[PDB]
Design an enzyme around this catalytic site. Structure first.
Site, mmCIF file in Angstrom:
data_model
loop_
_atom_site.group_PDB
_atom_site.id
_atom_site.type_symbol
_atom_site.label_atom_id
_atom_site.label_comp_id
_atom_site.label_asym_id
_atom_site.label_seq_id
_atom_site.Cartn_x
_atom_site.Cartn_y
_atom_site.Cartn_z
ATOM 1 N N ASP A 92 4.259 6.220 -6.890
ATOM 2 C CA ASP A 92 3.431 7.368 -7.246
ATOM 3 C C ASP A 92 3.725 7.799 -8.670
ATOM 4 O O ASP A 92 4.646 7.296 -9.339
ATOM 5 C CB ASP A 92 3.577 8.468 -6.202
ATOM 6 C CG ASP A 92 4.950 9.054 -6.139
ATOM 7 O OD1 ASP A 92 5.658 9.016 -7.147
ATOM 8 O OD2 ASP A 92 5.276 9.608 -5.046
ATOM 9 N N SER A 93 2.928 8.706 -9.200
ATOM 10 C CA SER A 93 3.044 9.027 -10.643
ATOM 11 C C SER A 93 3.846 10.293 -10.890
ATOM 12 O O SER A 93 4.120 10.646 -12.027
ATOM 13 C CB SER A 93 1.669 9.123 -11.287
ATOM 14 O OG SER A 93 0.724 9.804 -10.482
ATOM 15 N N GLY A 94 4.224 10.992 -9.818
ATOM 16 C CA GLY A 94 5.173 12.066 -9.911
ATOM 17 C C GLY A 94 4.598 13.445 -9.906
ATOM 18 O O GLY A 94 5.297 14.417 -9.518
ATOM 19 N N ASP A 140 -2.104 12.074 -12.561
ATOM 20 C CA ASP A 140 -3.213 12.951 -12.219
ATOM 21 C C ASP A 140 -2.718 14.337 -11.848
ATOM 22 O O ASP A 140 -1.518 14.617 -11.810
ATOM 23 C CB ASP A 140 -3.990 12.361 -11.035
ATOM 24 C CG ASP A 140 -3.225 12.421 -9.717
ATOM 25 O OD1 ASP A 140 -1.965 12.282 -9.736
ATOM 26 O OD2 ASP A 140 -3.926 12.542 -8.687
ATOM 27 N N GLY A 214 -6.623 14.241 -3.903
ATOM 28 C CA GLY A 214 -7.067 15.608 -3.667
ATOM 29 C C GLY A 214 -7.427 15.902 -2.223
ATOM 30 O O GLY A 214 -8.012 16.974 -1.980
ATOM 31 N N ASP A 264 -0.455 5.740 2.971
ATOM 32 C CA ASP A 264 0.988 6.007 2.994
ATOM 33 C C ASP A 264 1.155 7.383 3.629
ATOM 34 O O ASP A 264 0.278 8.245 3.423
ATOM 35 C CB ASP A 264 1.649 6.065 1.615
ATOM 36 C CG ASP A 264 1.225 7.318 0.837
ATOM 37 O OD1 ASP A 264 0.160 7.352 0.192
ATOM 38 O OD2 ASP A 264 2.007 8.288 0.850
ATOM 39 N N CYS A 302 4.402 -1.447 23.020
ATOM 40 C CA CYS A 302 4.962 -1.671 21.694
ATOM 41 C C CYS A 302 5.902 -2.868 21.698
ATOM 42 O O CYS A 302 6.783 -3.001 22.565
ATOM 43 C CB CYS A 302 5.712 -0.392 21.296
ATOM 44 S SG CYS A 302 6.462 -0.548 19.617
ATOM 45 N N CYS A 307 11.754 -0.669 21.496
ATOM 46 C CA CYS A 307 11.134 -0.635 22.833
ATOM 47 C C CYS A 307 11.613 -1.806 23.648
ATOM 48 O O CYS A 307 11.506 -1.770 24.884
ATOM 49 C CB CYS A 307 9.608 -0.559 22.661
ATOM 50 S SG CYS A 307 9.114 1.059 21.972
HETATM 51 C C1 62D Z 1 1.547 11.567 -7.180
HETATM 52 C C2 62D Z 1 0.266 10.749 -7.340
HETATM 53 N N1 62D Z 1 -0.996 11.465 -7.197
HETATM 54 C C3 62D Z 1 -1.463 12.064 -6.134
HETATM 55 N N2 62D Z 1 -0.748 12.087 -5.045
HETATM 56 C C4 62D Z 1 -1.191 12.764 -3.864
HETATM 57 C C5 62D Z 1 -0.409 12.790 -2.754
HETATM 58 C C6 62D Z 1 -0.942 13.481 -1.601
HETATM 59 N N3 62D Z 1 -0.445 13.711 -0.408
HETATM 60 C C7 62D Z 1 -1.398 14.452 0.381
HETATM 61 N N4 62D Z 1 -1.176 14.837 1.604
HETATM 62 C C8 62D Z 1 0.032 14.512 2.329
HETATM 63 N N5 62D Z 1 -2.413 14.639 -0.365
HETATM 64 C C9 62D Z 1 -2.268 14.079 -1.668
HETATM 65 C C10 62D Z 1 -3.092 14.054 -2.745
HETATM 66 C C11 62D Z 1 -2.543 13.361 -3.949
HETATM 67 C C12 62D Z 1 -3.186 13.269 -5.137
HETATM 68 O O1 62D Z 1 -4.361 13.840 -5.323
HETATM 69 N N6 62D Z 1 -2.644 12.691 -6.205
HETATM 70 ZN ZN ZN Z 2 8.477 0.586 19.807
#
Ligand code: 62D
Ligand code: ZN
Ligand code: 62D
Ligand code: ZN
EC number: 2.4.2.29
Lengths: 366, 366
Positions: A92-94, A140, A214, A264, A302, A307
């Protein structure tokens, strides 16, 4: 293998199944990425993560830039070497975790104090390079929900300017441009015109894959699905579609039905350490007294190692006692369950029966 | 295999190496038993415990009788089934941890409140039966240190009366008498005459093995070794000798030199979750800043899976971050190190070079 190649092998409605080929491995799609926070998928050795079926994991940049530090990880040989995972890593970008866990915002980026640092498109792409990411996310802004149309627009516009900066930073770094992929992130809150403007801006810059950003920010499943309905078709069809931060099994199924290829979530790891176990008959909380003498496995079908070997009664005891082995077993089962869900999704799309699978899955899970 | 057979294959001075054969497996001696507290060796699957070399584990009775309960474990099929360990288990008799962790003492036993319950010789032997123990310990009193000769004598005498009660309780239970072994525990504090009286009482009752109780209670290594010097030769030569609660690597080596065959300690698991790693050049604390960029394994010679795959730098990061995988990796390495120590001890006695090994081990470890 190539730096990046996405192939679609089969389709059903908006749903797709196929593969992403990268230098470090093949990713089967739709894909679920277990989350590594602080350079570990909580309570699992990397070999165990791979044994559950995972092809790729997500690395969180915010935590890693604070401890152990991105330059330190680069000095030590990169994130793959450091944690012992040799397959693809998406980073991710942080900024999402900066805004949720630590801040001063400007057009340059965000400054913040660790729970002082800076994060800009250029520094985010550089941190992801120092970690040795295979799939780099653009820097972003996840717009808060709810957002007014004016604020959603202003936020989306900033993110598209940062998307261009992210692209140029990534491309200016030869080793990164030759060996990694770069994904752009669509914003626009729940507004169809802003989602379209964002998709257009990202396609004009050009990315290897496109995330729907978003969402999963408190709008609820009906509204998330309504926005996915019009947003995913706006993105290039021939590139992967990533829905960030999603989610519960039913969210994944409906998102695949709307054209998403990658997911994820910390739900299976996080909630597993909490006592929630996924099953084909819906989630259970293993701490409940009803499980104290239940000799059945967490789930009756499973295939995971947990399991095969341990009972609900034993895992109930471990989680009630706060034992580390309870977090280990719950986490392995839940990530294995998510990977079995993704396998069932991929096979049903390949066989042109995903509609039926989605319906059958929901009737039993609910 | 037989219910119980102890064979001595080789000797050097007072040190012995050999095997205990039991229905559930063979135990190589001298043996180190990892400790299972609350039906788990902390942070390890049973398969991982076995992969380190362990032939037997210790089960703590006090914790198990409180949660999940001994009758519940019996209803679920016994401790082996419940936790997934199919080899021998030695169970303690509960009173040491009652007196350290929870009490009213009498000739009948001890009543105590969980951190209300009772524990008598008869109930201890019954709890160990309900758990399905392979090696049952007699119910004793670990005399506090220091103790006056009068108090040590009175305490030792009570324990010998409880030893006889433990023997009769165990023998009155056919299934237990036919399938398990029973060990008696010598007491007497640091006093040679009381140790001799205790040894005589226990040999007259007759046990499958004999523990040296009442040590590692704050007297320090010199004094523990002085007492072992005269106490171990008092016990029957042809049965195993167990030193309860010991200990650090150097304590084990010197205890083997004095005729001990079996050991248990929470040191490698406990201190591993704390950051202490054993190495042939002595212990290190992986949290120390010096390890933050050290790419070497925890130990340069160790054959364990942790040393094959991860660096000191990574394990330093995990333990500083409080990550579960750090406790998993530290615990696996430390129990593997203890098992490699026991293997080196067994091979050196078998080859008539244990004296030399002990000297070489200490010169380098210190
Ligand atoms: C960090 C990278 N960018 C980025 N991460 C996110 C991580 C999320 N995680 C959730 N719910 C668990 N919504 C998100 C939206 C973004 C998003 O709009 N942008
Ligand atoms: Zn299991
Ligand atoms: C619980 C069984 N009986 C029993 N356990 C013990 C456990 C110990 N643990 C230590 N140092 C860590 N000394 C001990 C002495 C005894 C002892 O005299 N008796
Ligand atoms: Zn090791």
């Amino acid at each position: 293998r190539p730096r990046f190649s996405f192939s679609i092998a089969a389709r059903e409605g908006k749903a797709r199944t196929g593969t992403i080929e990268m230098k470090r491995g093949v990713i089967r799609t739709p894909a679920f990425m277990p989350v590594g926070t602080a350079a570990t998928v909580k309570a699992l050795k990397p070999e165990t993560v791979r044994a559950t079926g995972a092809d790729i994991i997500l690395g969180n940049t915010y935590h890693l830039m604070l401890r152990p530090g991105a330059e330190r990880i680069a000095k030590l040989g990169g994130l793959h070497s450091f944690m012992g995972w040799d397959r693809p890593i998406l980073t991710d970008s942080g900024g999402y975790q900066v805004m949720s866990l630590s801040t001063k915002q400007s057009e340059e980026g965000v400054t913040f104090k660790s729970h002082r640092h800076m994060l800009s498109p250029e520094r985010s792409i550089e941190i992801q390079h120092l970690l040795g990411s295979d799939i780099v996310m653009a820097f972003d802004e996840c717009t808060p929900y709810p957002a007014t149309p004016s604020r959603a627009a202003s936020s989306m516009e900033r993110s598209m300017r940062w998307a261009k900066r992210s692209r140029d930073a990534f491309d200016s770094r030869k080793e990164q441009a030759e060996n990694a992929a770069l994904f752009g992130i669509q914003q626009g809150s729940v507004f169809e015109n802003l989602r379209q403007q964002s998709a257009d801006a990202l396609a004009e810059i050009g990315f290897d894959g496109y995330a729907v950003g978003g969402l999963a920010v408190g709008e609820g499943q009906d509204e998330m699905f309504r926005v996915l309905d019009f947003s995913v078709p706006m993105l290039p069809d021939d590139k992967p579609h990533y829905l960030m931060g999603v989610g519960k099994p039913d969210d994944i199924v409906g998102a695949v039905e709307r054209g998403i290829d990658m997911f994820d979530c910390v739900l299976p790891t996080r909630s597993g350490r909490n006592g929630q176990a996924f099953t084909w008959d819906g989630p259970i909380n293993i701490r409940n007294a009803r499980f104290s003498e239940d000799l059945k496995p967490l789930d009756s079908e499973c295939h995971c190692a947990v399991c095969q070997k341990w009972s609900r009664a034993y895992i109930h005891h471990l989680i009630r006692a706060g034992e580390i082995l309870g977090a280990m077993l719950m986490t392995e089962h839940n990530i294995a369950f998510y990977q079995q869900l993704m396998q069932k999704i991929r096979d049903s799309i390949s066989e042109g029966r995903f509609s039926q699978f989605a319906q059958d899955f929901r009737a039993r899970y609910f």
